[model samples]
Target: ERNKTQEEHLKEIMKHIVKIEVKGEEAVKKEAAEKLLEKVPSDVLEMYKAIGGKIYIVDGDITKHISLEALSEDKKKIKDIYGKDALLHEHYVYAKEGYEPVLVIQSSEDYVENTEKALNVYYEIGKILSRDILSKINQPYQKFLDVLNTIKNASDSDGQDLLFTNQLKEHPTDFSVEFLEQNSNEVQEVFAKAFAYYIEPQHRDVLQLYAPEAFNYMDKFNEQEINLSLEELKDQRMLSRYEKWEKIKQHYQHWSDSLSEEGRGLLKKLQIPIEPKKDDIIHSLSQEEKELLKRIQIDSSDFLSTEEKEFLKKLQIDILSEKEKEFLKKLKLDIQPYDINQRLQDTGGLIDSPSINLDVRKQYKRDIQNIDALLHQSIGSTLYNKIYLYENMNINNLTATLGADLVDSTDNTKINRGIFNEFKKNFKYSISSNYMIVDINERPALDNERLKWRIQLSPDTRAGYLENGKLILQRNIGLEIKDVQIIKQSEKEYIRIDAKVVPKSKIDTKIQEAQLNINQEWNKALGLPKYTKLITFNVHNRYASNIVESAYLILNEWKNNIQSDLIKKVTNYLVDGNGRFVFTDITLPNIAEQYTHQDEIYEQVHSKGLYVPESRSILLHGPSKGVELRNDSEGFIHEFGHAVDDYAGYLLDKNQSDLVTNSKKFIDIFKEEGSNLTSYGRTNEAEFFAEAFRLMHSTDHAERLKVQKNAPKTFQFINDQIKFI
Candidate 1:
């Protein structure tokens, strides 16, 4: 009956409702804003009407109607209250005591299309009217009570209403604490209903100030939940419910901390014991039950601290059997054993000398020492003696025939440093003998381009004992026969050695034919003599096929731009001198060490290509420093230029056997130019001619013109002498 009276009072207030007035230029948008305003629920409208409030919805700027001044001092006040970027139309509600509430809402596409935002604006207008206007009026507390009562009655079957909850949460100040205290019974129940739905901590705390009884009501509700969770915990086994119980305890820890001794006793029943103990009932249990209890003891041990776990592990190791202990020792040794075969395969079975860097060499030395320590600790003297004998038989025979001693000098009787270091780096062994023989099993290919056939020094320590970390030979054990063989697969190979399958040929014949065709095309394109020999290309297996294709494309581009006579001259010199182009994916530093003076050339001018005078070969790196400007094609042309200079010098004077650069005329030209063409050209007369020759036949017209302008005399000399045979 009280709820019915409240509903009737709310209807009576609505009867004299102040209709929302929408002011805008666009008729369509004004209609949209009006529909949105109509969505405001009766309780919110009734609350607004109790204070004699009216809402004005504007499609344009509501700030205009508010300020009415060019300077907009009132708008500045709004900016100060809200933020500077506050969109008055979207978020703010403009209301005053003696004036109608004006809300500026955009009729633009964004505002009109978003139905939720438009409806929320009207709800906000209602909230501000209640908070800012109605709360200041006479008997405002009574008015709020009436609105709250009506809303509570309307949402009786629906539980809590969102509109009513939002108002309580957003404008808690509107509900007076003094008024709630006077009507504590009814007001406290209403506050509890709203407080139950309030998620924000600050909102719950504010509602608690108004109705302290509501907080007590919630405390009872939480205790009931904790009781239900604890009951569920009691039904499950200790291990099954441990995780769930942990979460529940954390969730209610604050309440649990404040529990009475009797209340806390209820939670104590579900606790899992951290300390291990066997029950007296276990004496009558089955084997499975006993096993489960043992498992429980082991599983709960994980809760122990790190030091306790380590101590337990050490004690457990003591109980292991003899075979298991040996297996554990083997496992530790296997953890980081240096697998030489895998390293050989990764480097394509090529071992260039160690890096030239001091830090890198130092690190390699440390690595050798670490390997030595690992072997000595794990194998000791027994297994070490077995290895010594087996390697002695193999190495002694090989080194004797090869005429190189295992010891560097007869006086010292210590193993050769170079041979010993190589052995350490590539150490893979096999165990044999009832007496346990350990032998270096297979040799890795250390030679360039000979994967199948490898010549390796055997590891021998005959009449030698390891002392002061050195293999000290007591007998004159010179290195014996060096084994060089075509390694084959056998039962012994499978069990005792890990070897890579050898290819029949280094490069396929079909691929070689295709490479020859590329050079033939260059020969034909340059209009060289029909019988003129074509340069042969030898590509390493590691070189990419696409890089070979690109190299030819760059050569063809050079052929198209350069003078045919000059192109022919360079081609003839390369072919006639037996100068082949060798392409490899070997790193620059390693490649430099492989070929003599190549490192010197690389260090001097940062070039990745080299023309070997003795070998009459042009070496090119496929991936040179990832810098495309000094790419394989550029390297090839530059090195080929050096070849042309060599051939041209021999042609100029057969008897003298001196380069053209040494001629009086060429020397005079070189003195005048003084390395003006390129910085690399300043190295010597040969480089100046090569640099000038490269530019003269450049693909880019501007670069060709640059060479002509920069070194006209050298350009003319190349044109006059090198252009024709």
Candidate 2:
């Protein structure tokens, strides 16, 4: 009687196993669907069988076979049954407890074109069946539903709505069961484990939490598949799939090492060969052989000395020709073999060398000769004794004048070529030795006071003495000089001079005129009747005139185009608030130290311009490459936008608590349009308003139109608040 009872239990368990019906007129479609079904592991099929599940693969309309009324009484169409347009549907027949769960798939050529999609359909079937089983387990299924609904609600509130839609897609590598466990309640964890069991194999690591048996089975299956692939590749002598083999070895190295000797040997046969290290290879070679190998030179240093180079050359590899080697030897006189192109790239076309072209070589030689002459004139024949410049000089006592032509027009720190050749032509130097002192006749301050100048070079200044009796420079010479005063009294005199070393410029008058024009224009832009409050420009003497002219143009344009009333209001606010605009060539950190009070704000060194609310000042660097703003004009406009935001907030409220962007009307527009004007605009609401204001007043008509098209509401707000008013 006990044996009969055990048999009855087995029958009851077998009765719950799901059934699948593939109905199609096209035999090919039915076979395709059958192939996908066959790919599903038997173990997964058995898991589905544990719960009563049925699947129907149909070629035509699904409504013909699956009754709509059985799924839902209110459903009149197929879409209403699923509550959305779908290729697959899962439902409980008659919508009642103990009823058989059914899944219907609409068969088409789409599955044939995309095999991954066909495989996903079977996974979906498994997911639905597993969910049903979890429901019958008598756990808090309602709690799981509540957790899912809460996640959907939170995402919806953030405007993502990611539950049903693929708005924020997840990567397979990023999904883990621990993430779900940490984020969900205890009841939700049970539901998560069930769902993970039927997920894609890439993400099946999650199954280890609730289905360790399934995880182990999948792991063993993957190992067997990899081993079979390796065996087939070795037999065929194929070279591809090397990375796949490497990843497999990496993941299973311990297991591979523990295998039988023969198993390990066979696996190694398919792996990519690991080359011996150069040191190890060199250690094995004889002393004479090593010496010979070291003599061989390649364009890019690699491989094991001459032996490897000769071997590779024997295989018809292109070797450096004798002529090219000679060329390299000559160029190496001025620069190292490796640093030739590096120097060229770093200087941005200043030093062009390492070329085989005749014209390029000639030009390089001429540049070397020119630098040699300049050095000779500046420091005398002492340059010949020293291979590197600035070896014994006191660097601190010298003052450097980095010519405007040698520096980046926008960035003072970087070296670049400029349009003006006067920097090179107007360079004047007077050398003095201990035996003979050169008199400073250019300017005489007094009859008794004798003046002399001492020059020192930068550490990076490089020059080489060649066998051909020529001096070649690797880098442009940077000149730093200091003036000395020799005063003679009745018996003896003491030399006394201030610590200041003012670098005199030839175009001082031009610079002064440009400075005056900039001040006038700046005052005009502020709507000041006279030069009541002049803007300060601390610019490099070499490009002082150029920078001043650029700033003057921007200010002049703003003064002409902007509304006078708005300018008057801003001027009044600035006068009372101690607000000022400072243009300088100083580096950002130094500028921050001088202007900004807050430590956190001072640490941001990457910006091209800043408007410090605490200081009530707009600090801007000169024109630079690799920055967000196109010119100083755009930078001023952008920072001015921040100023406007600050003032507008104060205008509405006694303090800055109520910003223009904080208004309810602005937030509604922000929600609908978002901050898409510029990448910087997306930082926050204030930035969004400022960026919009900048673009709306842009000189480029198309840029203004972009604001109109992308953020019309923000544009209108800017126009109403700033331009007209």
Candidate 3:
């Protein structure tokens, strides 16, 4: 149906174009194409109609179309006299007694390609004739004047030279460098074979970008190619889809509206298909699949965050775009998201906490299941794992020939590309209004001074702390963070957060051995290097030691102090979770970076520490570039807050099942009754938990009692999730 409509449109255009008169000349030789020249190829007629050009073909012999005095009997003498090679078709601006300017060519060519090649000679001849360039050349047939006049304003130097010299200079091809030597006769064969080579769709952009004089001359040719070729429009149609019929209708309508009377007349005759529909019904889900979305019950009452509730309400009426559907599967809603100390779940039975209200947990559980079901319906998968399924499961770890087997073995690429690629493989990282991806091997994204959603990840050594031989979390830990302010750099600016690792004098040579490599991932478009390792570690600096250790000690005490078995079981599940404390040179990238997204890497501006939930690791930053690391134990307590959330949080699938309902009530109650502990504590519930924990223990005894007195429910909730002091 699509192709038929297009062909109908072309046939309509052909009717209007076939009668066009060039230079207002009456086509006295009006005849059917075959009558004008026997056995004329349909492709030839089609090309003529497509260009909207007038043709006057002469059958039998070429000498009959021109004055005999201007012609040479021998083809070689004809070429020498003209100072260039000659073609079957020839141009003459000087007319004899009964004639005006016209082209002459042999009519018996069998191949359309060769015939078109002959017509190119006519095109050049017509160009010189139209421009009246015959008087300027020593011989009117000189190919140079003939070649130069083919472009409008051929007198200008820009018209004579090629564009995109940089590309051509770098290329070792015959066409660009060797054939481009227009001064040699060796080049004239292609020049006459002919310069019409640049007229096709694929070659036009090359001329437009590289050869301007020729491009401007050819620009007129393209404009009349049915405003734009259907093929060209089809290419355009790919990027901008026709899903919204309104836009599609408006686009075609406005385009037709802008055309001239004759062009519009032809378009009307075409009776083109105005509406757009997908070729395959499978592109859109069946009614049964749409019903799947109805199962996702989103009530505003179940949400703590007003925005989340609003989003749910909007989802009721929203129609997912192609792109939205693509991303919908991986979309996650952090039910009761607690960001404090970054260690950061739904599903299953009611909570064991009496204070959490089991009924609320059930309601929250229902919401997630419905949402999850809708997601699975749309994306059609329980686990979307083409990325790692075989890489992890199929790889046999024998270190012999073919033993590593494409999955378990290290390709120098991951080493070179670093944690950034790893994150890309894991997350759908994108650069947008909401999120900015980071390089996993760097400290720059840590520049929290700017950009709301910042990220970083490194494979330990630098930007991290140490315990024995392994790395511990770097210090920049904080729990409460709800959102960030928008920062606009430029209309289309992207910031690069570089991971720099400088080996300070104290560490061993082996210590300088970079765990991260550069130039790893192959960009199919450019196949270029993705990242660089310019910059890792040491507990040698005891700067934040006391502060870091105490936070851990205090957290341990709170965990042990609990008496309730249910509280102990759940609390142990979080605080004493399976993920370990890994102090590395610091944090940067796998985060947000690995997630497939709008790719834009920019410059470094800040430094700080970060944690990774997916791998269950922590990276607390230490002193660097003259800035001393925060020696505040409260900071450590902040990171511990994150650990609690990750182990019991969304990092692990369904881990949120129990916590969402419990935490929703927990957050609202605490926020209502609790005093402002710190500016950071006001970030969110996760941070509030960590900060409130820090203040209750680190502050004076009177302050602790005041917290318990002021926010009794907050204290109760905290006490329930942990042991007593």
Candidate 4:
């Protein structure tokens, strides 16, 4: 902290802080603010909120979350304002606001664009919004309830398209609302499908009271509540009547059995289309018999001294002949895609975790052999990406990184060694083992995504007497591999694992990449040590295509290749630059194929293309459908803002630093960065820095349409984010 000149010292201090802008926009101060913010740590983006917002906003727990974006102008303005001064420092930036600059910036767009693209998960941003919504709703309970309910209803109307007339049963009108809330997942879905209807405030009450309890009797829920014994009301299994009448029944049952008689009497005084029907009434009702009767009540009820057959007319409930067809189609919806990158982890797949044993470990080592010959295994694996003769690019300029002996290296092959008993005897983090592997026969290599094959390593100590090592008992813990060692010399001294395997070609190629600056192997980025045993071959760039045609290629080669041995091996894969899968050498290949960085996907959306509607906007988003299911157009507006930072920043970077000299940094940069770490460039601090720029700015017209349409109120703030020139 003590070693710096006066100006340098001032700059360092300023780097950690930022000034807020609230009133009459100060283009100059805004520019200054961006420059100042560039100095703040990338890891702390969520800690800050928009300076342009009301001061009280800063003190509040929730900053009004506004989607941000940067058009070319926003980027240009910052540059024009800051000018050449930016040429001097990597830490300076000039920022301006997008239309809705003052907002809580962490959202789907912020996330997908900021971090990994291809974010298609539903509720990604909604969940974030859902988290702080409770704290934001400060109104009276009734008011909150009214507003939320109204919104929920509006959503229903929009969702179902408000097709058919809702079946109104007075029995449990109020309960319908409760039913809507309680069994919404099941009931609402069925109602949407059956009625081709959407609920609005006008129909909200009636719909709730009348919507059919069509699905309430399904396996998961049926037999649970409905007293099926009420033989009068048979279990309506996919009955068209159930879909038509019961869609509103949850609420009907609620009001029918519970509401006050006054409420019931009030209904008679009011004007409604249909009358309640008694069980005896339904016996004689025909398909078309009930419509005219309903119209009679709808037409007039002026002098109704005595209740008659008309008041008790049975409903001509619709039939669901297509029930089977509709249901079979629903099965295609998708088996909720898990975040393999974050969940299954290590897209490379075969994780030794603690499940290491001599036989399995030997098998693992063999799996790496003639990997090229096994191209079938890798064609779709992590090794799928083109293997290029990459030129090395290093920041620290250090060479020869070394890993533990556990992942050792020889002339052409590197054998991952096991951690001595002394090191991992204390393994933690969900370690488990079969204790006994009674291999009746080889179980078709268990899904690498779910299980790993390990040798039941049992030491034949005491005496070398049993089965002549034929039953070479494996000794592995359920524990994940913490750290392995082929050899451990001392704390700081590491045996340069067979210096020969890293072929100058592969090391040099990796050296050409982004994160290979350090002179060490296997530290933080790695989770478990499964790939330690896998083998690899030396490669070079001269024959880039050799990765596909040749037996093996260097790590120096660009990821993905026609000769996809690597791809075949990847149990999982992750998309890398050039839009292809790359190997982490440890993750599941299948997962990698599905593994996506929401940020990367959204940016591509913003860059490649997008569409927007005139009215009701898509606020929060997720992968509702389409390609690999990573495209989150539903949350396009938010996600696009994230892309702007990277896309626009890159444009600016081409000129100098992706940041325009005077471009303002994000107003609510920290709100998105610090608290939430799920955005673009989560791989390192620099990405954190880059995503900060993306969150604060926007640059696409498509995204502009979405934000403007969806969040009109916060328009100015968004405009300021991308306020370049």
* Rank ordering of all candidates by TM-score, starting from the highest: 2, 1, 3, 4
For residues 666-719, what per-residue lDDT tens digits would candidate 4 score against the true structure?
324433433343334343333343333333223444644543454343344434
**TM-score of every candidate relative to the true structure:** 0.31, 0.33, 0.23, 0.16
Best by TM-score: 2
Cα lDDT tens digits for candidate 1, 1-725: 65676567645654454233344345665455445544333444544553455545444555554432233444534421111345443343444333443333444444436534443354345334334333342112332354454444442423223323333444435444344435443343343244332323334464345443334443443334223222222223344334333432343345435555643332222121122112323353345533433322221321234544443344333333333333323222212213332222222223333323344335434533333332221222221211211222233211121114334355322234354333223222111100111122222222111122111212232211121122211111122112211111211110111221112132244346657677677657766555444544433322234335555666766567566666667656666655556654443334432344444321322235777665566766553432223445566677778777777777867666646766667877888785787777766787787778777777778988987788888878888866547
Clashing pairs in 2: 293-306, 410-623
Positional deviation of residue 234's Cα in model 3 after best superposition, in angstroms: 78
Candidate 2's TM-score reads 0.33
Off by over 4 Å in 1: 1-348, 352-543, 587-606, 626-630
Residues 410-493, model 3: lDDT tens digits? 532111222222212211111111001122111112211222232222222111111111111222221111111111222211
What is every candidate's alpha-carbon RMSD to the true fold? 33.4, 32.1, 25.6, 40.1
Cα lDDT tens digits for candidate 2, 56-120? 55644454565332544344222211125442234212111235655556665565455344434
Q: What lDDT does each candidate get?
A: 0.41, 0.43, 0.32, 0.25
